[PDB]
Design a protein around this ligand. Structure first.
Ligand SMILES: CCCCCCCCCCNC(=O)NC1CCCCC1
Ligand SMILES: CCCCCCCCCCNC(=O)NC1CCCCC1
Lengths: 487, 541
């Protein structure tokens, strides 16, 4: 079925002849004040926008039929953003000032069903007036008024269809419904990414074994937060070049290229928010290229400078919760296990802080592999949808697993490199977000990070596993936004 | 054969060193007091952990500050107790910009086939204003093959080991390589090794003079920074099922999309894109529907201006951009004005090249107005599908060198005769001469581009006359009340300037720009100006 929504005050609040032609479109705004400001005060009616994606996801045809008008005002920008935001969550836009006719003139209505290809019955309209809803039900449409700021609305709306949650999730941007940039930094290597919103720029780098798609919940919000996001596919993963050479992944290089990728893209500075392995790079970016980093934020991953008199490898042979990691060392091995069956491999890796079928991070060598435990047919974690997983699959089907793993296999070199930035410190805006129930990459591993990063601001989330962006998304967003906001 | 230059005093001016100087005298400081912390074969203390990249900048202040305070009252003149060097080294670094002529001198050899690069005594600026450096550094980025940052390779000038590290990568001998510095004390090693020394003193000329003497000659008014070849980002937005729009990106916001005309491609703005970016903008040289790497359907309806504008809008939403500056030329320009006319909200501002805002006559068949204007015959010729195509496709080489010619050049197109002699390239030479406005390669791109898209799609732009008319007739009671720019070309045969004159009846406040001796290919004929005009425009709004 389909869902129709007015705008005057059904998807934006506060709510709100000759200029009856202003509606029709023969006249613009700057055509005729003490009223302008009012259109700028109103914002999106989130729970309603929710109620929409709801159906949209549920297999309906959403849409907006409003009594528009052309805004050439001094503050139309607003409308744009709102418009450009609602854009993605509807199939058709029946703007009054676009099709000549305006509510409640019956010709507009006939125009909708017409484009909608539907019968008045299997279509429900939503208006805060009712004088505009008379036609709808008259036609055989399921009418629904507003009067208030929703609730009662979304309520008698639930009835027709399904139910909506009180505390929802941030809209998961996706899939192809996005732009796909492609920068070629070195001959054989090109880095694919994603883009959204207008500057300043902040690149979101993922970890192991993930993809840009991971930030699927941060990207939109972050954009709408007034930013130009660049969910990049880290070298080796997804649509970016994934060479077979190990040297190709030395952190020293990854950071260098990361920089190139900027020049190429003509961006002179960006905010670098990293997680997992990325997070490592992010901190090194901050450490080696201050100029190009506007600011840095890290999830789970803490800044752990290297010990100059302590073989980096030894520090791994030590920490017990880094076995699997060791297991990865040998090329072909680790790969062979994860590739053998990507389905499991993933539903396996991706599990909540409070969930079964965990990975074998420490018994790895001994039991023969990071997955030697765990069921065969893992259960879908209440953190990824089959589809959500399938993307990761398709992604990896084309890239393989060697490339990503080669991130681990550059220990000595990495050590030898990060040793140069031992006499200096991170003096650019920084953020360290710690996860609580994160088995490996435990919070307490930061504690002395300030010895290196004074002024370092922090953020911490409870009941959060390693998959922060996907486990506690809404919070991650908040924390992140509010962070950028205050700097 | 390569050529390198110590950025501060060669690529960047006024040499930061100058600031120290003018600061010494300021506080009656004996010649070279705080100067040592920069110009001294005494690379020691903190200033040596700085260029060495061991410690950042911010640290180098509290440390250097006190290391200065060393000889403060001890062995030397009075150096204010609380006296620091933070915000004084900071300004000097910011107040400095790129040495345009010298950069020129570089791209020269680069073009000429040399291995440019920069060997500077760097330091990692984690300053409150380190951005500046990023930009200037992000710019010089593309013009050099190698960047030898002192603060990145451990060694700093003039310690021999650095130099021996450069040739190592440049895989060259001391003889076939030239070094540019503003000190000379830094140049001493170079000569001794076997390199071509040159005191980058003075400011320019004199340097480029003694330079010229060993390379070639440099333009007096060089050709603006061109953004090509494949050294760019390539976005790809899918607006409707089968249709996806490819484009190009550069710099940081706000956004302004550059739409091309017929028969061109994003590559046309190759001269505006960079400059525009460097002008503080995020450019989107888009490949108009039908052209190059964007979907180029076979349907005619697919190109109704009404649609092109709609999709143009979608392309924005999709890209998450809520507003942009729309600068159009030719057919694009038309759309651009309609964009302004139909979607005010999404247009921050509009600029048009050659193409004027010509609303439609409500009581005058749009077609008739074409059958009338004599300089629109070829256009008419295009009407019939397959025909026009067949002519332009038969041999893209000519087709292009043909279309693309200067205001003052031969082999013109047959804009009015067409229909009669059947064709536009009909009476044009067999093998046209390369116009002093496009390089063979420049043309080849257009070829490859069109080889994959064909010619139907682009032409379908012409074939939507009635519909277009019927549509633009809706925006007859309103006007363009958003910032606008109308740039007129002088020697533009078709799309003559005088066709604007009453544009203000529709667009008050409409600002204008006009260029002389300019044909239809404005962006390629008078690029530098187009840039200026455009920039200065955006600048003042
Ligand atoms: C002394 C040098 C120390 C360098 C430390 C670099 C940081 C290592 C981060 C490793 N991260 C991961 O291995 N993540 C995987 C663990 C298994 C489940 C998915 C996520
Ligand atoms: C619906 C009314 C349309 C009115 C058309 C106004 C002017 C459109 C611009 C046309 N531009 C061109 O035809 N340019 C070509 C002309 C032949 C040589 C290359 C450039």
């Amino acid at each position: 079925r389909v869902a129709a929504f007015d705008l005057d005050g059904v998807l934006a609040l506060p709510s709100i002849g000759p200029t009856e032609q202003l509606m029709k479109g023969k006249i613009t705004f700057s055509q005729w004040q003490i009223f302008s400001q009012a259109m700028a005060a109103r914002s999106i009616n989130r729970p309603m926008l929710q109620a929409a994606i709801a159906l949209k996801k549920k297999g309906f045809t959403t849409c907006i039929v409003t009594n528009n008008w052309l805004d050439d005002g001094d503050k139309r920008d607003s409308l744009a953003q709102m418009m450009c935001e609602l854009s993605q969550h509807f199939d058709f836009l029946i703007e009054s000032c676009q099709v000549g006719m305006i509510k409640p003139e019956p010709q507009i209505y006939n125009f909708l069903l017409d484009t909608l290809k539907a019968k008045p019955n299997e279509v429900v309209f939503l208006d805060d007036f009712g004088s505009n809803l008379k036609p709808a039900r008259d036609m055989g449409m399921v009418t629904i008024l507003v009067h208030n700021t929703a609730s009662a609305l979304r309520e008698l709306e639930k009835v027709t269809g399904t139910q909506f949650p009180e505390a929802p999730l941030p809209v998961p941007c996706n899939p192809n419904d996005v732009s796909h940039g492609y920068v070629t930094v070195k001959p054989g290597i090109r880095l694919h990414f994603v883009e959204m919103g207008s500057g300043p720029a902040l690149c979101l780098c993922h970890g192991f074994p993930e993809s840009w798609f991971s930030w699927r919940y941060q990207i939109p919000a972050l954009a709408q937060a007034g930013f130009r996001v660049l969910a990049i596919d880290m070298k080796g993963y997804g649509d970016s070049s994934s060479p077979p050479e190990i040297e190709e992944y030395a952190m020293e290089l990854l950071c260098k290229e990361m920089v190139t990728f900027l020049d190429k893209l003509g961006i002179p500075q960006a905010v670098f928010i990293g997680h997992d392995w990325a997070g490592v790079m992010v901190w090194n970016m901050a450490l080696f290229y201050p100029e190009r980093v506007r600011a840095v934020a890290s999830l789970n991953t803490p800044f752990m400078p290297p010990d100059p008199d302590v073989s980096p490898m030894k520090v791994i042979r030590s920490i017990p919760v880094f076995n699997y990691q060791l297991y990865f060392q040998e090329p072909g091995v680790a790969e062979a296990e994860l590739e053998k069956n990507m389905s499991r491999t993933f539903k396996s890796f991706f599990r909540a802080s409070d969930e079964t079928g965990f990975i074998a991070v420490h018994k790895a060598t001994e039991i023969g592999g990071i997955l030697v435990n765990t069921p065969e047919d893992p259960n879908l974690s209440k953190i990824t949808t089959e589809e959500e997983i399938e993307f990761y699959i398709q992604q990896f089907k084309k890239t393989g697993f060697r490339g990503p793993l080669n991130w681990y296999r550059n220990t000595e070199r990495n050590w030898k490199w990060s040793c140069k930035g031992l006499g200096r410190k991170i003096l650019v805006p920084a953020l360290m977000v710690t996860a609580e129930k994160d088995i490996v990459l435990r919070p307490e591993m930061s504690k002395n990070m300030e010895k290196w990063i004074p002024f370092l601001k922090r953020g911490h989330i409870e009941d959060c596993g390693h998959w922060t962006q996907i486990e506690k998304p809404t919070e991650v967003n908040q924390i992140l936004i509010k962070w950028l906001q205050t700097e």
